[PDB]
């Protein structure tokens, strides 16, 4: 069994190497099967607050709401990593149909975009600082990895198949 930080460096480097790479549960397992608390396993993504500050209704509902947001946030990350970045990548509008209906439905969703590099705030959206030519590839890959990892954990929790199901359910309010 690979060490936590060993597997983490490996996965993050692979995602940076190939932006469209799919990760299996077998690869991700050392990251989510760890006995470490949720707040300790995530070093960039604020997974703890995401789970806690969006506990509205039953877990069957809000975990799916969170999963939907995480699915889109992952796409935002992979876009920044792609060899050909999509047009208009330097900014995300709050009134964007995709963002508004998926990411902005969760508290902390905008903070994830800030982690990607969208740190400058205007009343109409977030964007990269003027003068910053390229995204921080190492940072984006790390955040993207943690986003897809968290979505994976929520999927397992919903399927009642998470290796640390019993412990993680205590985080569900």
């Amino acid at each position: 069994e690979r060490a936590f930080l060993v597997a983490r460096e490996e996965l993050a480097s692979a995602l940076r190497r190939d932006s469209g790479q799919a990760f299996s549960l077998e690869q991700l397992r050392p990251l989510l099967a760890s006995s470490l608390p949720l707040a300790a396993r995530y070093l960039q993504l604020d997974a703890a607050r995401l789970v806690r500050c969006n506990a509205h209704g039953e877990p069957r509902n809000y975990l799916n709401t969170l999963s939907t947001a995480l699915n889109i946030l992952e796409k935002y990350g992979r876009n920044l990593l792609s060899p050909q970045r999509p047009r208009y990548w330097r900014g995300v509008k709050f009134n964007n149909p995709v963002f508004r209906s998926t990411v902005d439905a969760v508290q902390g969703g905008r903070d994830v975009l800030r982690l990607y590099g969208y740190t400058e705030e205007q009343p109409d959206g977030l964007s990269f600082p003027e003068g910053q030519e390229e995204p921080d590839e190492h940072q984006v890959a790390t955040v993207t990895l943690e986003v897809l990892l968290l979505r994976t954990e929520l999927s397992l929790l919903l399927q009642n198949t998470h290796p640390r199901q019993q412990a993680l359910e205590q985080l569900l309010e």
């Binding site: 796409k75 999509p86 009134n95 964007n96 995709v98």
Partner: peptide, 13 residues
């Protein structure tokens, strides 16, 4: 679909 521009700016196109 577009994930960056505002809904109205996308509606202009």
């Amino acid at each position: 679909e577009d994930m960056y521009r505002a809904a109205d700016e996308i509606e202009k196109e």
